[model samples]
Target: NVSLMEKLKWKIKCIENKFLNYRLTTNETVVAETEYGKVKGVKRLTVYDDSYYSFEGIPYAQPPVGELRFKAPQRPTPWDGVRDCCNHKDKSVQVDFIAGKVCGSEDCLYLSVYTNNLNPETKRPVLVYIHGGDFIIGENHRDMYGPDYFIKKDVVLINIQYRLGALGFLSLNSEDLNVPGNAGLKDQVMALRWIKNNCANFGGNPDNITVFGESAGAASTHYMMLTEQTRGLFHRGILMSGNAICPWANTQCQHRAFTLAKLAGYKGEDNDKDVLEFLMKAKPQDLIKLEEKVLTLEERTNMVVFPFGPTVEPYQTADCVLPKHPREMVKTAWGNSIPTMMGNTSYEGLFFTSILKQMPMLVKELETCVNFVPSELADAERTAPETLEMGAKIKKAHVTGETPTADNFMDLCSHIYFWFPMHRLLQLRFNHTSGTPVYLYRFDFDSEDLINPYRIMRSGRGVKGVSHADELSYFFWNQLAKRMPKESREYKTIERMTGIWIQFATTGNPYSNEIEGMENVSWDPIKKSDEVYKCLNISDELKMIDVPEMDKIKQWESMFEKHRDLF
Candidate 1:
């Protein structure tokens, strides 16, 4: 007879072969392969009454904890076996913008992928979304951003998570440590790199990736376009209601870091060695909790409440993301040259000013606050009196009559914050390069439902203008759209918007022969001169016309000319 040890070895080999054969023959929905390892995904019916695969909670970067807490994101380690990626991951630590409650975690650098096509041979266009919550609050949760509608258009959608607030943006200004701020922005780059290497496994064309977002997320997309780190990671960009050139997008981050350090009980010198050490040792919860207390009343009133954001770091730093100013980079065509579609809502400021309706003291200052515009982007030598004088002229123009009130506050805030910045960004991109095309739009479609998702405008019943993020509700199919009937106008509008978005992502043109409703609609590219500048005004009826409030835009342009050095 054979020896006992020899018999045992033969049995083990037989079992291993059997297991390998089982894996090869299995048709399980949970099993799939990634660049790192095998992942298990789930199948579900989409809103279009079709099936799609969803792979959630896939880690794109290693957890930024311990020594990695405030440094650049590192690549995750590959796993040995099938990883259970069926559930949504924990979001990054953040407080609700309006309610102010702590939620999320430190280990949250995960991404979710939803695809209707699973065949690697038939690659589909990819849309990778970065969420917006002032760089403080938000996540890649399905409840926040569903892929049901986009899947119907035969596209793959990916949602990513990054560190937020103090955890992501607190800069120590350290040249040696490579903590030159914008860790959150770098986290985004890492995710795109991961997708570039592995998305084809999910039937996504890595070469046709589009980065899109709203508000802070939109600003992040523009920042990605400007940064050298993310140049080849994406091919197209879609910006909604935000841009890097906006004044509120960046503050003196070093000063903000100092204020945060003080609030967190750091009683040391402003040197990076001491300050950064104190911050890194502090509890993550403490840093997040201290965000509101560190800011002044003016910042909260002006809606420039985000304490941590992208900063211009020293050029000598090794991985300096934003070495030069955003405007300076765009002026010299240093940004990623890609086709872009950017636009804003009619009342982008209503979201922030809605809570300040009763506080007339704060409301009155809305029209006169020089802080609403960045000092660096304005005349550096401008006196307080001169700024106040210019502020008054702005008030006289936008603030209905004499005293500023809540009724007309949205107009002034929107123009200064959203309209001017978006217009400026489009103009810069259009003028910077003629090889790539730039599409412009104005989201003027206001929903009639009183119980709408635009909670910011609830208090202001008379504020009938389209509120910020109003267009987003119709862009994707979610629980909100389920409430509306199939034959309803709102549902049709959803189809129209989704169709246009799908067409744009696939062909770089909004209007196409494939998209049914838009066949008659013509979307012309933006022109350099305002005289010929026409944007697709998306409303109950789509119409192309010159930029809205052309007269007001002229006045704003004139004011901008006064601060030419800043612009």
Candidate 2:
């Protein structure tokens, strides 16, 4: 009944009101009280048009400096007033790839929380994410790993930073030093404790928390379950292409502390105190550069070159993180009953192309079998006739081309470094208990637009399948390139991935709730009742398969059984 002019004016008024509401939502500041003190944060909108609050760079522990270096984290001192936490703080000190130099600081143990509500009465599910950079270089930053999709689901998301490289993991194996290593992991524990005590203020249920990470971070997540320190801190875990038993997860060289000292130009006393003093006084950049040099020839040849990863504490102390080898510790199954989700890409070895390209000759040498023995078997046991025979068969089964390039070596690298380790852990954990089921997946999604490794390396002509990290952007709008078109295949991939993860955090099962564009899909977790291993194949659509790549993995299993003592 309204006139034409009146109708037009009413539509314009509604549009203006909507814009005003959005502006106010963004401009509003939020304040939440932590156990330490009050913190002020900001509100922002997700790409999906949902609102969430972000409190970034809140200190969770005291600074690990001076005498505290290479020691367990201590609780943060109480603050007097509200601290401004609206921005990301200093990242853990390490080689900054983007800047081409060392950056960040020693005082970098901070955490960030993002939530859709701040009412203490609300009990939203909490997800704590640990970033991965081979346990060396990574931090908690929204610009690097934005939580847009998770925030849209109305779940509380938390990200944290811990020390890296030697600063976080130096050990002398001396009782007097009291530096039993695993400071980085201990820093993570402190952060978890802080969240347990304070997440209620941000509308998160402390009792219902899920821990998830990729690569080294994923291994760290698994490592947490292997120890008693993190038993009650989290209820579920999601490991993306990593586990505690991976060859690269443990340190083979305990003498790295002494090796670093010599590299620092120390010529005085050879005792622990003098060496520790000299190393501490030297610049952290100096120490970081010495990391690659500390690698032994055997470690480099075997490709087990992570300089400072978690290791068995030589002597048990009050704050030891890893008192025993993962193999021995995993038997009793510290986290047998914890629900888990794990997966690896079709080609995780694509992550190592840059290193392989420089060592083509080594790739050829690998054909001999003996030269490529895993660092875990570098002792005299490697020379056993049975061991050499097994290695040769493994080489002939997979290695191809006389002048092998990086592509030809992808499968072997993926199996030894990632695939086999993941499978072994799955077998061990599955066999050890009959509790909550473990959901296994093979991330085979391969859209050219989502090929992140190719983009980052600035080359992709030769890469054939989904590389390591290709699945990451699907869960978060990570600012990698730009958002995919709404109608694009990349967009749908995001829905499936983020949809699965968000649902898992809300409910223990990933496919409990139906996802759009794939409502008929239902996922099943691996169970002891199944005769053959079962896992979900994630691509354009979800399909259940009987454990992909079983033939090659079986060979590795045979070898492990024979060399169990050496391992």
Candidate 3:
């Protein structure tokens, strides 16, 4: 009934409103204005029904390629415009034994950030994670380490990537030189610096940050605590199943580094400068895939040792991260006094014993490996007479009586690689600093009925208890738990464990009041007055005990006193 002009005007007004609504709904910008530049992230809903903005694969440092290879990480370059951080970038290049192929790339110095709120006014706590793969392999991919669980608790989560293996940890033999060790560790410091300066832009409190990880990642966190550069990077830490002082975690890799350089076609003299120059120029693929003589479980008393790891840097340099040995640093309490929690699984060594299925003879070969001493300690024993005596005592305790069966082999390996190392660090902290809070825990829960077949920890089915990385399943939302029913114990276990972790991140204590059934539970930090060292044991029911393995721990404590200075 309207005239032509009136009809045209009505249509035009409707189209304009539609366009505005479309812009509001589809083009709502979620830009985080960082120091480098503006970054656009994607908004998605989590299983918890909470919405979060995930900024994936943002460059924290310049690519460590060409001349930058083997050197400390450089600051990331500023961008001209908003960088679309919607897709994951390449992970660090490394050989994948399980997948049977080369994976990742050299230019993988990126990190991911997840936040529930981007408003700078609401400054939430931050948790930065470092992945673990024996310092050789690892990636910050969403499939392996998603930030859904942490962001639900309103903490900003940051997953980081750094150089690995020879590229990251190789150290040359020299007194005063530029080729100082722990380039990977330095990468972490650089990332923290970036976060301290820029994280507030993404709704994160730079002042309250916690760095945490599992296995090698855990060891890295402990190392960060010791380094002088990392003094203000993070305020608290959570170390699960690894520490800086772990036997396999720390190493004297000068000889190994030189051997690797020689194999990679270094024709010059074996001096630090020549070796580093050749290594820097060599192909990354060839070096990463290069097969080095790694000591197998059958070949050594300890199966945890790898080819490349942290080393003592030259003390002459003013910015030396590790000025002296990690043990010496621990002895002097030469680290920031921060609240920390450290723990390990019930049977961590079972992860290594999966090879027994492929080679049954490894069980018999364990007899010799159980009695093996580290070559460095053996060399020190040439001058120190008591070293040999203490070594014998340790051998007698584990190998003399027990037969070389599969169970005995697993027990011996677990004690040497995981248990003793963690206990020693806790003892050092208790002995040196009294006022600082240090919490210890033991993860003993095992639901064989709910074990995921794809998990390596499940390999301990018949021979052992909860294997290494079992506790991880409870913390993160994984594919294995997708089929689990809500009424199942495994489901409840996940909820309880997740709550505990969240509570710890929120408050310094790990106890949670939101968990309905665990209302009466309490977790107390280690104190000097407690006659027995106390730790919270996570099993069928949460129990607080004086000591988890009292007898075995006491025996190792005696051996530690005898060979305290040998290592």
lDDT of 2 by residue, 415-525 (tens): 887878877777777657667768877888887675332234423435667777778778755434355677887877787887788778777788743675445555678
Instruction: Pull out the clashing pairs in model 2.
Output: none
Candidate 2 weakest ten by summed lDDT: 452-461
Clashing pairs in 1: 30-40
Which ranges of candidate 2 are over 4 A from the true structure?
A: 1-25, 120-122, 298-303, 374-384, 400-405, 450-464, 529-531, 561-567
What are the clash counts of all predictions, listed in order? Answer: 1, 0, 1
Tens-digit lDDT track for model 1 on 186-261?
8998898988888888888888988888888898888888887776787888888888888778765666677788
* Candidate 3 TM-score to native: 0.85
Worst 10-residue lDDT window for candidate 3 reads: 20-29
Instruction: List, residue by residue over 1-567, the lDDT tens digit for candidate 3.
Output: 223554454456446644532332323348788889999987755454556687887888999888778778889889988999876898777886344356788888988898877884568888888888788888886646766555666778888998888888777657544567788888887888888887888888888888888889998888888877777677788998888888778776766655677777777676777777777778887788773454334434434367777888754454466778887777664343778888888877677666666677866645444234444445432335554554555555556455666665666677777777777677667667747787778888887655432253224445547777777767654433343566777767777776776666667677776864567666788776654667778887777776655566666567545466643
For each candidate in turn, the TM-score is: 0.88, 0.90, 0.85
Best by TM-score: 2
Return model 3's CA RMSD, one decimal. Answer: 11.0
Question: What lDDT would candidate 1 get against the real structure?
Answer: 0.73
- Distance from true location, Cα of 365 in model 3, Å: 5.8
- Candidate closer to the true structure by TM-score (higher is better), 1 or 3: 1
